[PDB]
Design an enzyme around this catalytic site. Structure first.
Site, PDB file in Angstrom:
ATOM      1  CG  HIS A   1       3.837   5.907   5.460  1.00 57.31           C
ATOM      2  ND1 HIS A   1       3.768   5.687   6.753  1.00 57.31           N
ATOM      3  CD2 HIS A   1       2.685   6.544   5.113  1.00 57.31           C
ATOM      4  CE1 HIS A   1       2.665   6.127   7.236  1.00 57.31           C
ATOM      5  NE2 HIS A   1       1.957   6.675   6.211  1.00 57.31           N
TER       6      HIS A   1
ATOM      7  CG  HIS B   1       1.510  10.486   6.799  1.00 55.02           C
ATOM      8  ND1 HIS B   1       0.543   9.705   6.200  1.00 55.02           N
ATOM      9  CD2 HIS B   1       1.024  11.738   6.693  1.00 55.02           C
ATOM     10  CE1 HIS B   1      -0.452  10.501   5.765  1.00 55.02           C
ATOM     11  NE2 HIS B   1      -0.162  11.723   6.059  1.00 55.02           N
TER      12      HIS B   1
ATOM     13  CD  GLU C   1      -3.494   9.750   3.529  1.00 51.52           C
ATOM     14  OE1 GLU C   1      -2.973   9.683   4.629  1.00 51.52           O
ATOM     15  OE2 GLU C   1      -4.194   8.858   2.896  1.00 51.52           O
TER      16      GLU C   1
ATOM     17  CG  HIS D   1      -0.778  -0.172   2.418  1.00 52.10           C
ATOM     18  ND1 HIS D   1      -0.980  -1.403   3.002  1.00 52.10           N
ATOM     19  CD2 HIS D   1      -0.282   0.607   3.413  1.00 52.10           C
ATOM     20  CE1 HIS D   1      -0.622  -1.401   4.269  1.00 52.10           C
ATOM     21  NE2 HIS D   1      -0.194  -0.167   4.555  1.00 52.10           N
TER      22      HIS D   1
ATOM     23  CG  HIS E   1      -0.464   8.603   1.877  1.00 56.32           C
ATOM     24  ND1 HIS E   1      -1.158   7.518   2.073  1.00 56.32           N
ATOM     25  CD2 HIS E   1       0.148   8.927   3.096  1.00 56.32           C
ATOM     26  CE1 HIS E   1      -1.013   7.085   3.307  1.00 56.32           C
ATOM     27  NE2 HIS E   1      -0.253   7.915   3.945  1.00 56.32           N
TER      28      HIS E   1
ATOM     29  CB  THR F   1      -4.835   8.185   6.565  1.00 54.30           C
ATOM     30  OG1 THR F   1      -3.460   7.873   6.229  1.00 54.30           O
ATOM     31  CG2 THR F   1      -5.126   9.515   7.362  1.00 54.30           C
ATOM     32  CB  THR F   2      -4.090   2.717   6.046  1.00 56.39           C
ATOM     33  OG1 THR F   2      -3.287   2.773   7.255  1.00 56.39           O
ATOM     34  CG2 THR F   2      -3.377   3.439   4.914  1.00 56.39           C
TER      35      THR F   2
END
Ligand SMILES: [Hg+2]
Ligand SMILES: [Zn+2]
EC number: 4.2.1.1
Length: 256
Positions: free
Chosen positions: A91, A116, A103, A61, A93, A195-196
Site C-alpha cells: 500500500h 510499503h 511517512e 485509509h 501513503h 504506522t497505523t
C-alpha cells in the site's frame, strides 16, 4: 474511529492506542549524518518472480494490493533479517500536495508518497501471530518523487476507478511487484512499528535510499480516492500519513 482528520488524526491515536507513545514508534526522520554504516549487514534478497496478486481493496485509509501468502512465492530475506518473510500486501501513503505524503523523512525531506511492502516472519505461521512478535514483520519502504511516469505502476492507477470508496474491492491478478523497485537496493534499517493503529512494535523497517519517480498524473489519481463509503459525504483520501516519531533509544543503520 481513527483516521487522518483534525478530530481523529495521529495526535489523537494515543487515547485508543497508548502504545502510540511507545519506545519503538514509526515513522522517524532518517538523519543521514548519524546513521551508522554496518558492514555486517547482508544484501537484501528480494524473490518476487512467483508473486501471486489476488485483489485490491479500499480499506478506508488506503488501498491494499493483496497477495497469496499460503506458500513461499514472494519472499524477503537477507539484509538485517533472520529467516524468511512473506509478502502479504503493499500500500501507499500520499499527500494532498507533491511536497508531502511520505511517512519516513530523510534529513527532514518529505517525499510525494511512500510505498510499503508488508512481509511476515514465516516462523510464526500466520500474520496474526507475527504481529505479537518483536521480529514479526519486515516492511520494505520505498519513497516516490514526482517526475517521469512509472510504467510499472499504471495497472494499479487504472483500477482505482473501481475501488473508489471504502469497502470496495476488485480482482487484481498477475500484478508483478518487481516493477515498483528502484535499480539500487541500498538501505537504512531500524526497529519500529506499524504506522497505523494498532501501531504494534513488531517491525523491522527497511527503507530504500533510492526513490522511484512517478508522474504528476499518476499521483493525481491516488488523490481521487475516498476515505468514505459509497453514498456518504465525499472526503478525499489525501494525507493518510503519520508524522515522524521520536527516535528515542534507537540506532539507524545503513547498508552503505
Ligand atoms: Hg510486536
Ligand atoms: Zn504503510
Amino acid at each position: 474511529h481513527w483516521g487522518y482528520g483534525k478530530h481523529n488524526g495521529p495526535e489523537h491515536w494515543h487515547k485508543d492506542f497508548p502504545i502510540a507513545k511507545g519506545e519503538r514508534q514509526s515513522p522517524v526522520d532518517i538523519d543521514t549524518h548519524t546513521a551508522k554504516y554496518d558492514p555486517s549487514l547482508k544484501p537484501l534478497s528480494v524473490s518476487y518472480d512467483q508473486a501471486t496478486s489476488l485483489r485490491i481493496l479500499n480499506n478506508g485509509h488506503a488501498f491494499n494490493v493483496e497477495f497469496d501468502d499460503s506458500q513461499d512465492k514472494a519472499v524477503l530475506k537477507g539484509g538485517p533479517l533472520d529467516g524468511t518473510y512473506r509478502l502479504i500486501q503493499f500500500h501507499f501513503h500520499w499527500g494532498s500536495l507533491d511536497g508531502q505524503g511520505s511517512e519516513h523523512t530523510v534529513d527532514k525531506k518529505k517525499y510525494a508518497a511512500e510505498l510499503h511492502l508488508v512481509h511476515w516472519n514465516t516462523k510464526y505461521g500466520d500474520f496474526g501471530k507475527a504481529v505479537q512478535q518483536p521480529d514479526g514483520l519486515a516492511v520494505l519502504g520505498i519513497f516516490l518523487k514526482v517526475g517521469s511516469a512509472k510504467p510499472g505502476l499504471q495497472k494499479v492507477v487504472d483500477v482505482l476507478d473501481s475501488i473508489k470508496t471504502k469497502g470496495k474491492s476488485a480482482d487484481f491478478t498477475n500484478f508483478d511487484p518487481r516493477g515498483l523497485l528502484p535499480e539500487s537496493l541500498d538501505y537504512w534499517t531500524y526497529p519500529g512499528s506499524l504506522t497505523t493503529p494498532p501501531l504494534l512494535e513488531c517491525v523491522t523497517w527497511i527503507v530504500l535510499k533510492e526513490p522511484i519517480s512517478v508522474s504528476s498524473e499518476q499521483v493525481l489519481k491516488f488523490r481521487k480516492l475516498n476515505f468514505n463509503g459509497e453514498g456518504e459525504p465525499e472526503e478525499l483520501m489525501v494525507d493518510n500519513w503519520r508524522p515522524a516519531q521520536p527516535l528515542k533509544n534507537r540506532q539507524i543503520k545503513a547498508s552503505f
